[PDB]
Write a protein that holds these residues in place. Structure first.
Motif, PDB file in Angstrom:
ATOM      1  N   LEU A 111       0.846  -1.107   0.049  1.00 25.41           N
ATOM      2  CA  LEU A 111      -0.058  -0.111   0.015  1.00 25.41           C
ATOM      3  C   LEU A 111       0.682   1.339  -0.127  1.00 25.41           C
ATOM      4  CD1 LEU A 111      -2.791  -1.087   0.114  1.00 25.41           C
ATOM      5  CD2 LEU A 111      -3.278   0.191   2.178  1.00 25.41           C
ATOM      6  N   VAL A 112       1.924   1.047  -0.897  1.00 28.31           N
ATOM      7  CA  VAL A 112       2.841   2.433  -0.951  1.00 28.31           C
ATOM      8  C   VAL A 112       2.696   3.035  -1.969  1.00 28.31           C
ATOM      9  CG1 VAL A 112       5.524   2.934  -0.707  1.00 28.31           C
ATOM     10  CG2 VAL A 112       4.478   0.473   0.115  1.00 28.31           C
ATOM     11  N   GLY A 113       3.181   4.291  -2.101  1.00 23.27           N
ATOM     12  CA  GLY A 113       2.794   5.380  -3.045  1.00 23.27           C
ATOM     13  C   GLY A 113       3.959   5.218  -4.156  1.00 23.27           C
ATOM     14  N   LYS A 114       3.950   5.675  -5.257  1.00 18.41           N
ATOM     15  CA  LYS A 114       4.710   5.416  -6.625  1.00 18.41           C
ATOM     16  C   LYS A 114       6.027   6.384  -6.253  1.00 18.41           C
ATOM     17  CE  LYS A 114       1.155   6.397  -8.863  1.00 18.41           C
ATOM     18  NZ  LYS A 114       0.471   6.851 -10.008  1.00 18.41           N
ATOM     19  N   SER A 115       5.787   7.335  -5.257  1.00 18.17           N
ATOM     20  CA  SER A 115       6.994   8.268  -5.044  1.00 18.17           C
ATOM     21  C   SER A 115       8.172   7.528  -4.153  1.00 18.17           C
ATOM     22  CB  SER A 115       6.675   9.631  -4.291  1.00 18.17           C
ATOM     23  OG  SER A 115       5.500  10.194  -5.212  1.00 18.17           O
ATOM     24  N   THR A 116       7.490   6.674  -3.535  1.00 16.37           N
ATOM     25  CA  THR A 116       8.390   5.701  -2.464  1.00 16.37           C
ATOM     26  C   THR A 116       9.242   4.721  -3.170  1.00 16.37           C
ATOM     27  OG1 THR A 116       6.717   6.009  -1.025  1.00 16.37           O
ATOM     28  CG2 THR A 116       8.674   4.451  -0.575  1.00 16.37           C
ATOM     29  N   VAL A 117       8.774   4.037  -4.058  1.00 14.31           N
ATOM     30  CA  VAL A 117       9.430   3.286  -5.098  1.00 14.31           C
ATOM     31  C   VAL A 117      10.251   3.832  -5.985  1.00 14.31           C
ATOM     32  CG1 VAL A 117       8.908   1.307  -6.625  1.00 14.31           C
ATOM     33  CG2 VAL A 117       7.083   1.929  -5.161  1.00 14.31           C
ATOM     34  N   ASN A 118       9.853   4.939  -6.672  1.00 14.57           N
ATOM     35  CA  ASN A 118      10.973   5.763  -7.518  1.00 14.57           C
ATOM     36  C   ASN A 118      10.754   7.174  -6.747  1.00 14.57           C
ATOM     37  OD1 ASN A 118       8.679   7.053  -9.448  1.00 14.57           O
ATOM     38  ND2 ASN A 118       8.247   4.852  -9.113  1.00 14.57           N
ATOM     39  N   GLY A 119      11.806   7.682  -6.040  1.00 16.06           N
ATOM     40  CA  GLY A 119      12.103   8.881  -5.412  1.00 16.06           C
ATOM     41  C   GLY A 119      11.216  10.014  -5.931  1.00 16.06           C
ATOM     42  N   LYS A 120      11.034  11.013  -4.898  1.00 17.56           N
ATOM     43  CA  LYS A 120      10.315  12.254  -5.223  1.00 17.56           C
ATOM     44  C   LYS A 120      10.991  13.132  -6.185  1.00 17.56           C
ATOM     45  CE  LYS A 120       9.068  12.451  -0.471  1.00 17.56           C
ATOM     46  NZ  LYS A 120       8.843  13.403   0.870  1.00 17.56           N
ATOM     47  N   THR A 121       9.947  13.811  -6.869  1.00  9.98           N
ATOM     48  CA  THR A 121      10.535  14.701  -7.773  1.00  9.98           C
ATOM     49  C   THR A 121      10.032  16.156  -7.598  1.00  9.98           C
ATOM     50  OG1 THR A 121       8.816  14.161  -9.447  1.00  9.98           O
ATOM     51  CG2 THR A 121      10.903  13.134  -9.656  1.00  9.98           C
ATOM     52  N   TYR A 122      10.938  17.229  -7.978  1.00 13.40           N
ATOM     53  CA  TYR A 122      10.758  18.610  -7.738  1.00 13.40           C
ATOM     54  C   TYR A 122      10.712  19.296  -8.987  1.00 13.40           C
ATOM     55  CZ  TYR A 122      11.302  16.923  -2.779  1.00 13.40           C
ATOM     56  OH  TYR A 122      11.422  16.088  -1.761  1.00 13.40           O
ATOM     57  N   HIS A 123      10.585  18.667 -10.178  1.00 11.20           N
ATOM     58  CA  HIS A 123      10.940  19.200 -11.396  1.00 11.20           C
ATOM     59  C   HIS A 123       9.947  20.570 -11.675  1.00 11.20           C
ATOM     60  CE1 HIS A 123       7.024  16.557 -12.352  1.00 11.20           C
ATOM     61  NE2 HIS A 123       6.819  17.556 -13.240  1.00 11.20           N
ATOM     62  N   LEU A 124       8.794  20.395 -11.298  1.00  9.99           N
ATOM     63  CA  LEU A 124       7.708  21.383 -11.425  1.00  9.99           C
ATOM     64  C   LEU A 124       8.034  22.839 -10.967  1.00  9.99           C
ATOM     65  CD1 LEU A 124       4.511  22.523 -11.413  1.00  9.99           C
ATOM     66  CD2 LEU A 124       5.272  21.041 -13.371  1.00  9.99           C
ATOM     67  N   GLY A 125       7.958  23.913 -11.950  1.00 13.06           N
ATOM     68  CA  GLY A 125       8.313  25.200 -11.481  1.00 13.06           C
ATOM     69  C   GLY A 125       7.350  25.971 -10.865  1.00 13.06           C
TER      70      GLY A 125
ATOM     71  N   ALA B 153      -2.190  15.324 -13.146  1.00 14.92           N
ATOM     72  CA  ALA B 153      -1.232  14.402 -12.734  1.00 14.92           C
ATOM     73  C   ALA B 153      -0.669  13.832 -13.971  1.00 14.92           C
ATOM     74  CB  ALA B 153      -1.687  13.244 -11.762  1.00 14.92           C
ATOM     75  N   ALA B 154      -1.663  13.439 -14.783  1.00 17.03           N
ATOM     76  CA  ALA B 154      -0.892  12.740 -16.287  1.00 17.03           C
ATOM     77  C   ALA B 154      -0.216  13.672 -17.104  1.00 17.03           C
ATOM     78  CB  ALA B 154      -2.262  12.186 -16.893  1.00 17.03           C
ATOM     79  N   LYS B 155      -0.613  14.997 -17.080  1.00 19.45           N
ATOM     80  CA  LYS B 155      -0.197  16.155 -17.674  1.00 19.45           C
ATOM     81  C   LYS B 155       1.343  16.252 -17.454  1.00 19.45           C
ATOM     82  CE  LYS B 155      -2.034  17.588 -20.687  1.00 19.45           C
ATOM     83  NZ  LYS B 155      -3.013  18.053 -21.509  1.00 19.45           N
ATOM     84  N   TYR B 156       1.358  16.372 -16.041  1.00 18.60           N
ATOM     85  CA  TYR B 156       2.652  17.126 -15.432  1.00 18.60           C
ATOM     86  C   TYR B 156       3.567  16.015 -14.920  1.00 18.60           C
ATOM     87  CZ  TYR B 156       0.732  21.558 -16.587  1.00 18.60           C
ATOM     88  OH  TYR B 156       0.199  22.747 -17.208  1.00 18.60           O
ATOM     89  N   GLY B 157       3.386  14.667 -15.114  1.00 17.76           N
ATOM     90  CA  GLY B 157       4.066  13.696 -14.476  1.00 17.76           C
ATOM     91  C   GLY B 157       4.148  13.986 -12.818  1.00 17.76           C
ATOM     92  N   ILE B 158       3.318  13.911 -12.077  1.00 18.16           N
ATOM     93  CA  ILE B 158       3.093  14.615 -10.734  1.00 18.16           C
ATOM     94  C   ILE B 158       1.750  13.857  -9.990  1.00 18.16           C
ATOM     95  CG2 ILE B 158       1.739  16.516 -10.925  1.00 18.16           C
ATOM     96  CD1 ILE B 158       4.850  15.694  -8.739  1.00 18.16           C
ATOM     97  N   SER B 159       1.824  13.523  -8.744  1.00 26.77           N
ATOM     98  CA  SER B 159       0.945  13.163  -8.049  1.00 26.77           C
ATOM     99  C   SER B 159      -0.475  13.900  -7.810  1.00 26.77           C
ATOM    100  CB  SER B 159       1.430  12.937  -6.643  1.00 26.77           C
ATOM    101  OG  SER B 159       0.357  12.297  -5.740  1.00 26.77           O
ATOM    102  N   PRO B 160      -1.512  13.075  -7.911  1.00 28.06           N
ATOM    103  CA  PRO B 160      -2.918  13.794  -7.279  1.00 28.06           C
ATOM    104  C   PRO B 160      -2.978  14.693  -6.512  1.00 28.06           C
ATOM    105  CG  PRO B 160      -3.196  11.681  -8.441  1.00 28.06           C
ATOM    106  CD  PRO B 160      -1.859  11.882  -8.255  1.00 28.06           C
ATOM    107  N   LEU B 161      -2.352  14.041  -5.306  1.00 27.09           N
ATOM    108  CA  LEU B 161      -2.300  14.485  -3.859  1.00 27.09           C
ATOM    109  C   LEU B 161      -1.621  15.701  -3.856  1.00 27.09           C
ATOM    110  CD1 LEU B 161      -2.027  14.828  -0.815  1.00 27.09           C
ATOM    111  CD2 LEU B 161      -0.221  12.977  -0.920  1.00 27.09           C
ATOM    112  N   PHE B 162      -0.283  15.730  -4.732  1.00 22.66           N
ATOM    113  CA  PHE B 162       0.432  17.373  -4.940  1.00 22.66           C
ATOM    114  C   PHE B 162      -0.395  18.464  -5.619  1.00 22.66           C
ATOM    115  CE2 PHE B 162       3.277  19.942  -7.249  1.00 22.66           C
ATOM    116  CZ  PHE B 162       4.237  20.561  -6.385  1.00 22.66           C
TER     117      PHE B 162
END
Ligand SMILES: [Mg+2]
Length: 97
Positions: free
Chosen positions: A3-17, A41-50
Motif C-alpha cells: 500500500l505504498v505510493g509511487k514516489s516511495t518506489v521511485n524517489g520524489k521529484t521537484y521538477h515542476l516550476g 497528474a497525467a499532464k505534469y508527471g506528478i501526484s494527484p495529492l500534490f
RNA sequence: GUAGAAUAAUAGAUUUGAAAUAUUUAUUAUAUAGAUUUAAAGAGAUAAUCAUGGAGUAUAAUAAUUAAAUUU
C-alpha cells in the motif's frame, strides 16, 4: 511493499516550476470536470495529492460534490448506514494501540 | 450591575512547512473470487403494571362512668 505510493518506489521529484503550478491552479479554477486531478497528474508527471495541495477547485464544484455525497447517503438502506458507522468506529479504534 | 486580568472553545486575519509510506490518507460505486453474519410469529427467565383471590394483620356497642398516667 504494501500500500505504498509511487514516489516511495521511485524517489520524489521537484521538477515542476512556479509558472507551471500557477497554470495548473488556473486550470483547476476554470474547469474541474475537464481538468480533474488525475488528468492534471497525467499532464505534469506528478501526484494527484500534490495537485490537490497546490490548488483549490471552484467552490461551486465542491458544493455540488457534497450534495451528491449527501444524496448517495440518503439513498442508503438502514443496514448499510449502520455498517458504515461500525466501519468508522473500527477505523477510529485501530489508531489507538 | 460595570470594568479589568487567567484559562478553554469557536471565527477571522497574517505567517507556516510539504511534491507530504494518495499504484488509498479520508469516502463512493460496481463487478470476480472467497468468507461469514443478521430473525422473533411465538416462547423462556427476571422484573414491573393491572387484576383475581382472601391468607395474614388490626379490631369486637366505642358509648357512659370509675381510678391512674401524659400533654393544655
Ligand atoms: Mg433480538
Amino acid at each position: 511493499n504494501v500500500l505504498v505510493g509511487k514516489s516511495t518506489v521511485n524517489g520524489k521529484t521537484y521538477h515542476l516550476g512556479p509558472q507551471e503550478i500557477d497554470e495548473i491552479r488556473k486550470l483547476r479554477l476554470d474547469n474541474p470536470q475537464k481538468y480533474t486531478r488525475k488528468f492534471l497528474a497525467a499532464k505534469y508527471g506528478i501526484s494527484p495529492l500534490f495537485v490537490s495541495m497546490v490548488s483549490k477547485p471552484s467552490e461551486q464544484h465542491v458544493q455540488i460534490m457534497e450534495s451528491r455525497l449527501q444524496e448517495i447517503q440518503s439513498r442508503w438502506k438502514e443496514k448499510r448506514r449502520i455498517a458504515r458507522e461500525d466501519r468508522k468506529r473500527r477505523k477510529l479504534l485501530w489508531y489507538q494501540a
